[PDB]
Design a protein. Structure first.
Lengths: 193, 193
């Protein structure tokens, strides 16, 4: 039958137990999925030495994912684009396969709570029915500030793939992109503006 | 007909004109290929704030490419392995496709000149007949030291791929792995040993 993900019940890679205790309710609220056989789901975390709003300024830009994500040749949103839920983008993917475009829909965008997410709704690639949520969270300790970004997804496991290799793949990509996010926004922080 | 690559005649991404002028002869010697229609070739560079021998200690470890390369699930060399030209490794690749192993042969290993290279000799993936060379080079300016790593390859362009997308893919992967090499060996340098 279907089941609920348990991301909110264990400490994910990249997070401390202290940070987890502060985020458990957010993980439950935004990073929970009902998951069916044949799907995989994961939660990744990344610490960033930058203020929450600096990081959020990059995370929220649905029209420019290539600012922090790897393997993007181009991203188009057309002309009428406004940052509203329901908007779509066409991402041309860099892969060893022939050309492929991923069409992606903006599912969530909450600037007050720092939540966004999207769904892959078409394209010929290996993350069919992918859906993902990213949240941004601030931390402080004796005047020092930092941010944690949480990114979770659910996706279908292709016929002939094992669950483990689909999850390893998607996890590897998400982890690399959060590392890029960390570099980009830490640079932005060092420089001000 | 066949032609020679011109990597040694222009400044590659990631290198300064001053650094190029010092390396042009090495690019000619080690990063030249005779290339046929249907193949692509590229030269990438990466500056590393670490001594040449620190970087070389990681670059030369043919049995542990996952120390600096991305998307490696495992790498096996068996039991009799000695670091000699002709040895092979089986690299299990992380991809969105079903399981695949790349069998790779060590083509060059010169510890005096800091040159190594390998050939993909089998496996079902999209870099057929890939062959690559990596060289490591030291620089100094008023007591400050740094290293440049050059990595070139030639590879077949799969039927139905464009040249541009094969090169974009292989370039993206090589560039990410050299960035990882830079982080790993800069950390090793900061810590000594
Ligand atoms: C970069 O952004 C995105 C990336 C992806 C990539 C998915 C995928 O399956 N990629 C495969 C290559 C591949 C295989 C077969 C058909 C097409 C592509 C891989 O890399 O192994 C999806 C949405 C995105 O927004
Ligand atoms: C990580 O190390 C290596 C990586 C590669 C990857 C090659 C390749 O074509 N990868 C594809 C995915 C893919 C597609 C179809 C069949 C198998 C795989 C991609 O990612 O789009 C080769 C040698 C290596 O040593």
């Amino acid at each position: 039958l279907s089941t609920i993900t348990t991301h909110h019940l264990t400490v994910p890679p990249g997070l401390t137990p202290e940070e987890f205790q502060e985020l458990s309710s957010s993980i439950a609220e935004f990073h929970s999925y009902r998951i069916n056989p044949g799907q995989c789901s994961s939660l990744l975390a990344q610490r960033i030495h930058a203020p929450v709003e600096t990081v959020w300024t990059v995370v929220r830009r649905f029209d420019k994912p290539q600012t922090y994500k790897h393997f993007i040749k181009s991203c188009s949103v057309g002309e009428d684009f406004r940052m509203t839920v329901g908007s779509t983008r066409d991402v041309t993917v860099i892969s060893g396969l022939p050309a492929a475009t991923s069409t992606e829909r903006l599912d969530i965008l909450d600037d007050d709570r720092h939540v966004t997410g999207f769904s892959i709704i078409g394209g010929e690639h290996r993350l069919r029915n992918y859906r993902s949520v990213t949240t941004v969270h601030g931390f402080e300790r004796d005047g020092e500030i930092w941010t944690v970004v949480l990114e979770s997804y659910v996706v279908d496991v292709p016929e002939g793939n094992t669950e483990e290799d689909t999850r390893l793949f998607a996890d590897t990509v998400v982890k690399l992109n959060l590392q890029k996010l960390a570099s980009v926004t830490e640079t932005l922080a060092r420089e001000a503006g």
